Amino acid sequence: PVDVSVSIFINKIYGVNTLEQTYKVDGYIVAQWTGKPRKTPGDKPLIVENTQIERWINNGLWVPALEFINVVGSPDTGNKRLMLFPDGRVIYNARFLGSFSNDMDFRLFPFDRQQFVLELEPFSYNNQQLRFSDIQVYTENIDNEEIDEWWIRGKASTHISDIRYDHLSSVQPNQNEFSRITVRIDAVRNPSYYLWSFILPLGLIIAASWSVFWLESFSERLQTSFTLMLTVVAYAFYTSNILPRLPYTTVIDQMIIAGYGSIFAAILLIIFAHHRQANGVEDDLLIQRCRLAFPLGFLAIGCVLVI
Amino acid sequence: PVDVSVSIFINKIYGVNTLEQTYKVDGYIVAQWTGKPRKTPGDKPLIVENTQIERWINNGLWVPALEFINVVGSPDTGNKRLMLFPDGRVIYNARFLGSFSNDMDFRLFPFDRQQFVLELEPFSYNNQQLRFSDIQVYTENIDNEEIDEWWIRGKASTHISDIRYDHLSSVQPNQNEFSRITVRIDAVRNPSYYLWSFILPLGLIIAASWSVFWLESFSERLQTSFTLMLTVVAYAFYTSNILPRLPYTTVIDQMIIAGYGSIFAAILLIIFAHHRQANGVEDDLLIQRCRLAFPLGFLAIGCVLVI
Amino acid sequence: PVDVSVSIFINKIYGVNTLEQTYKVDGYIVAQWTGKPRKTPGDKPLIVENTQIERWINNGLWVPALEFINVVGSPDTGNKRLMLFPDGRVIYNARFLGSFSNDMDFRLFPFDRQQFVLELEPFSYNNQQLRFSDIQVYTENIDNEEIDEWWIRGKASTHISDIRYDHLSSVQPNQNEFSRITVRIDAVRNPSYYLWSFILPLGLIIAASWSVFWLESFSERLQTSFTLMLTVVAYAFYTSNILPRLPYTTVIDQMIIAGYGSIFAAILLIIFAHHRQANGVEDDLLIQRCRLAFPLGFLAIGCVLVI
Amino acid sequence: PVDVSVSIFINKIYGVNTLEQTYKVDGYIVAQWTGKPRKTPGDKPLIVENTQIERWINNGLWVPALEFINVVGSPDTGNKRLMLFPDGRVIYNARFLGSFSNDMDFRLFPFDRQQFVLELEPFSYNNQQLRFSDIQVYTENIDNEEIDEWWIRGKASTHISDIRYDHLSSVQPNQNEFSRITVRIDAVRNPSYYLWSFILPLGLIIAASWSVFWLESFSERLQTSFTLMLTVVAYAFYTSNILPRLPYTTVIDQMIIAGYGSIFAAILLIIFAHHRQANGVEDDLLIQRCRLAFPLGFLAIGCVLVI
Amino acid sequence: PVDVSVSIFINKIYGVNTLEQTYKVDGYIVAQWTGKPRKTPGDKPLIVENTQIERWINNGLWVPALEFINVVGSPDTGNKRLMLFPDGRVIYNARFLGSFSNDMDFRLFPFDRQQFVLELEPFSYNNQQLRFSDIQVYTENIDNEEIDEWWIRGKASTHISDIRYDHLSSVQPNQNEFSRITVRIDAVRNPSYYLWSFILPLGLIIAASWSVFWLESFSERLQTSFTLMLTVVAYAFYTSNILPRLPYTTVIDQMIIAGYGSIFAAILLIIFAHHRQANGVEDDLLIQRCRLAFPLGFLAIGCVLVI
């Protein structure tokens, strides 16, 4: 098996689209192997640019096709270059733009922590014909940066493994195992914009919802409660386009559902207070003094939603 | 007829867009047949990569064109590979990305159950010239997964049939029947996000709409009813972009229309109560005690909308 | 002139985008003519697949280029095939996806009735060099179906005509007339979703707007009228993205403008009733008994907006 | 210099996107020049279709490349054709689809008046090597039509000029002047949809805002004013997506800002009336009789915003 | 090293998309170097158009590939041209459309000031094989213009530097340094549309929020405060799509958060005034005379948010 030595240079990560869990990676890939010696013009390496490589592949040069496994579409290959040396070794350099995809887990949404994965694999040659020796990843352009809201933490992890395929088992009986390269980059979401735009106003709205019990008139309490319900419905719409649509419940989601529960609890409490009159002559003191109990225990419910 | 043996490997299903009823499938297809024996370099199979196959087709190699019938556009074919054996058999491997389309029936919308269909067919050769022997489908990467809200249930069904075409009947009189492969995957929608985001708030709003009859003042009842109508109109907008636009009525749709009916029924009931005065001195007791009847029977109406 | 015999097979119509009045047609086109006899391998017809046809056109085969006149962009030609017979006749089969455009008249918008038109024409050869003999259209896959909200009614009309061009009159003096094929399919919009989503709620809102005159307090009437105006403004936004923007007035549009007129008429009537006091001691009876006149005549206005 | 005689045929103008000030033009271009005489098959002109022209350019035929200067992207060239005559003259016909751009001035927005410009220029040859003799424009398909809201008024103006370039001055010292063709089409916006959808409701809302002074209770006046402010905010959102975002102020914009000013003026006037009590015993007569002054002078302000 | 002399002509800058911080640049690039002398037809320079250059590169002409480093995608290269002179020098002219990206800092958002950067670099040749002599930038078409809201101030800065690469250090040990060209254009945002559309209405809403203390009834103050909170929530939605989502706080953002704080402060102040009764018989004078203190100090807070 011929030993290819990959080197990936990440130029920028951008376009992190949490709705579909894709992200666009731009960069360069440099593969390098050693073949039979050849005669080049002079004693110097020869550079073959894009759309000329095909004239060399037709004449019989061995250039393998490396593909990105987790790409959504096909990578927008820009320029490509092939450097041939007189001593025998070949270097294939190419520029890629891709929309890669990874399994993101938005369980802790504003305080999220994901990782961006590049998976690279030969398309045709198993590990008895092509083996990856090593990979370096030069992620120096995005070492400690803030792309839009993602801090790129630490270095980039690399790994070389062997993936066994089964749809090729009938056509390649006992040799259907392919060498694979994985590159992982840890990114932490910046929670500031959500903190001052989606959590502080919801906290103020929920506290104001608690503040309806200071009224001494029942009808005004009902109309006020419905106005607050309308405002919470406005935030129900206003948070819909932020993140995709998942079985479980995020942090902003808990605040929205807690706001709905607070509005409904206040409405039912004032209805029950209006119905609390046994003979219609008794007034209410203890159930309208929930201005200390209804907030505080609610905060404990918030603790249950946090931990 | 030459016997082709297809094998499809589904890599991921994603981008399930219910508005247009398309879905994107990414994967590999491996066709395989047997031709005349040939002399290859050594005693080993020969691999011909992408953009080299054309040099072999020009010289006279028989490679059929398989097409996907239910595709919206053209499949984004990435790499492709052709393995030729000395014993005679040929293997064509290719990678596809496609936006396929199927007839979806959103009658039970949050609790939906659809299936994703791949239909594959030769473009030029009828079943007297090309016949599909079998198909295996290796859907192991998405066996029991949750792509975004779709559980992929069970294995993948496969079928081989013969489709007879009529626009080719004048050009191919008695042989216009094409062999076809169908692949079906059963998927069940995950109803959780709609359950806690589109059904619980509508239930609370409808119950609060029932709660307007506890007021003892007519004008406040009217103004409260109009505020509730405004909130239900907000959810009328808020549910518009979820699913496409169909003649029949889904589950969230029934809740919205039931909310409109509840608001209008309450308005007409309080107007009729205000008009119920025969001489202007009589008050109302029985028609304002609908706080047990107006909810409960409405729930029975909900049963009619469920079953 | 050589006699081409076209046959079009419509596979599906979808993506009917009323904002730009385009629609996507997917299908196959089969042209067929007769040339000089030739020697094929054996006594059997010869099939030339895509990207091989060019080797036959370079050697001198006559294949005309048929274009779609009313296409927005260029048709996404998928596979194409060329069948050559020993007796002499040639058959060109191709698969197209196109975004076609037609002049749509949304005067009766929910109860609309449009037709989808395909116009096909040789690009280079006038009717002294290429003449269309006939066209069959095999629209059997969409014969009586419901694509999203369009019932496809009846069969597909076909027509063959001659279109005379003037920009080619200086370069082709007396022969600048091109044979053309037109295919028309009649489609009727399904009005159900608009009926239960855009007309019933507007009717309820307008009737509730009529219901403000039962109040006996002037200030509450004004505040109620402004709340109803806010709701009608919400539907003014909610109907904006449904259909494009036209000089005339559709059916939902009339309901929106009628709602605005009802709100303003009620406001002016209650202002005039408050000003109706000649000396400030007289009350109002007849002008507040418009609860029978203000609805009913409004319905007559609706008749004027219908017929 | 060789004399090219261009002839442009506009097929349709559509997709007029005022946000980016682009518009899509579809049509045909027919260039024509005279070269050396040649021998064609027979005594008849020879037609060379698309993807065959390259075989003639490789052998040495002179075909110039005409480009569109003001295009956003690259023109979607469909079919192209080359007619060669035995007497010597060559005719190049091509079909284009382009997204052209022009400097639009939306100062009078619903009653707008723009013009659509096509600029055509040789890419390589200056006017000492290629000169445009004349241009005809056959805009007969869109002569007096209504595309969506644009009336195409009159004929199409044409012009031939010489544009001098400076980045080519170092590489072409005294000959860097290129012949250019300009085509201008005058279009007038159809103001009807904005008239009945964005000006009549704003007029009704502003007049209703004037109508708050008829109330005799201060708190109800304040709450009514805030409800009207909420409605005007709804139209502030509802008008945002219509036209792009410009330093100056359009007609609908003036109505929105005037509505804000009316709400704030009414609020400040009722606050000042409540504070107008010198000793707390005096009531207000003259400042609450602004029901004739506050509308009328406002209309004069509208005149200032019109002229 | 061969000395290339680049000259860039910016035709238009448009599509400045602040959400992703890209901008589209359209223009021409003219590279020029000197090679060995050659024999051309006549004594005149020879022009080689697009799709003909490849026939010259195959025969052995040295044309380097210049790439744009900061491009999002691949530049839409339109026409390209190659002028070869008998004295020996070669001129490569090309037309580009690109979506370039730069690091934008929206700290002072309506009064912003960014710069647009073009970075150009050879793809294959280091500065021992290709060196940039100089660059001129002819930005005369956008010298002092207003594209949509960006004034292009002054001339265009140019710079030539050497960038050292590390992923090429293992394949090119001591020569991995590439010559680079940078072009910077200073642009200032036009703040007018935000001034009259996003700051004046927020100022009026905040001042009206201050105006709630003139009421003498507690329940009406609460309901009024909640209505104002609903309006501020409407502007919270209405400002979301203007600029991307950043850790820090812009100018409109400060106004929105200040509005929320004003609503909550007024609610807490009126609750504390209602609770201020020591025995329930005392009224409030000083804490309701904050109509001079609550605005004025708030303005000082605004100063803290400005400076």
Ligand SMILES: CCCCCCCC/C=C/CCCCCCCC(=O)O[C@H](COC(=O)CCCCCCCCCCCCCCC)COP(=O)(O)OC[C@@H](O)CO
């Ligand atoms: C003082 C009185 C208080 C008034 C009460 C006010 C009302 C307040 C809200 C109450 C309901 C609480 C619902 C909150 C939902 C909490 C959210 C939640 O449960 O999380 C997910 C389920 O979500 C969901 O099904 C959403 C469930 C919501 C559906 C509501 C059903 C509850 C019954 C309600 C009937 C009416 C009330 C009856 C009272 C008499 C589980 O994700 P899981 O980790 O498994 O990963 C998924 C896996 O697929 C990952 O691959």
Ligand SMILES: CCCCCCCC/C=C/CCCCCCCC(=O)O[C@H](COC(=O)CCCCCCCCCCCCCCC)COP(=O)(O)OC[C@@H](O)CO
């Ligand atoms: C106490 C008093 C109560 C107050 C009443 C409050 C008001 C409450 C709403 C009432 C109307 C109910 C409408 C609900 C509509 C239910 C939805 C429905 O019917 O389903 C679809 C029809 O939808 C539709 O046409 C929608 C129909 C709605 C149009 C409204 C017409 C009803 C008349 C209304 C005139 C005014 C009232 C008059 C009262 C005096 C049938 O799909 P189908 O399976 O065939 O597959 C289609 C096929 O093409 C698949 O290929």
Ligand SMILES: CCCCCCCC/C=C/CCCCCCCC(=O)O[C@H](COC(=O)CCCCCCCCCCCCCCC)COP(=O)(O)OC[C@@H](O)CO
């Ligand atoms: C009890 C008192 C009642 C209160 C009144 C309440 C208010 C209620 C609304 C009233 C205005 C009615 C406007 C309704 C507009 C009806 C819609 C309409 O007229 O249709 C189109 C014109 O639209 C339009 O210009 C829209 C016109 C609306 C502009 C408003 C101008 C009317 C004057 C208003 C000044 C203020 C009132 C003054 C009262 C003192 C004609 O398309 P047409 O077939 O030609 O094909 C086009 C061709 O280009 C196809 O190629």
Ligand SMILES: CCCCCCCC/C=C/CCCCCCCC(=O)O[C@H](COC(=O)CCCCCCCCCCCCCCC)COP(=O)(O)OC[C@@H](O)CO
């Ligand atoms: C009875 C009391 C009445 C209450 C008052 C109610 C409030 C009512 C509104 C008032 C403000 C009026 C603003 C209306 C703005 C009018 C719109 C306008 O002026 O047009 C553009 C400027 O826009 C703009 O800067 C918008 C300017 C608006 C910014 C507001 C500043 C005014 C000060 C406000 C401070 C608070 C008030 C203080 C009162 C004590 C000029 O384009 P120009 O042709 O140059 O081409 C551009 C070139 O770049 C083309 O290439």
Ligand SMILES: CCCCCCCC/C=C/CCCCCCCC(=O)O[C@H](COC(=O)CCCCCCCCCCCCCCC)COP(=O)(O)OC[C@@H](O)CO
């Ligand atoms: C009379 C009584 C008055 C009532 C009070 C009314 C309420 C009014 C609002 C108050 C909170 C103020 C928050 C305003 C936030 C100001 C905005 C701000 O601080 O700027 C950014 C932080 O944003 C942010 O974290 C947003 C922070 C907001 C989160 C809120 C936490 C504050 C605690 C609140 C708990 C409840 C109150 C408790 C009172 C008892 C810093 O960017 P920085 O330059 O570093 O570059 C980033 C780097 O990554 C660039 O690469």
